[PDB]
Design a protein that fits this description.
structural protein; mainly alpha; part of a larger assembly; about 55 residues; rod-shaped; 2 helices; 2 chains
Chain lengths: ~55, ~55
């Protein structure tokens, strides 16, 4: 009965690995958008741009 | 005649000083005291003091 019960534990572990894989797949694009946001802000910090570039 | 040419040159000088600008900003017309261009990724500036020529 114990050895049969272990299969559900393996299924739960595999389900948790799948959930973490989905979270990492989202984190890739989240980090990329954060990098592009830092680029846009660091470029906007310059005072030599005209108002249209800042907008 | 020398006075008239002197006044015409002063007007052309003021015009050329007015036209010294690049995409709406300048270091020559006196519209601003300085421009702070980027120096590093953290946002530190490389200041360039304006030199008015008006």
């Amino acid at each position: 009965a114990t050895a049969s019960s272990l299969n559900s534990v393996k299924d739960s572990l595999q389900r948790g690995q799948s959930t973490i894989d989905v979270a990492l797949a989202a984190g890739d694009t989240i980090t990329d958008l954060l990098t592009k946001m830092k680029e846009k802000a660091l470029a906007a910090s310059d005072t030599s741009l005209n108002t249209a570039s800042f907008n | 005649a020398l006075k008239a040419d002197f006044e015409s040159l002063r007007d052309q000088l003021q015009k050329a000083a007015t036209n010294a600008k690049f995409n709406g900003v300048s270091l020559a017309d006196g519209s601003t005291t300085k421009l702070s261009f980027l120096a590093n990724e953290d946002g530190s500036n490389f200041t360039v003091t304006a030199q008015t020529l008006s």
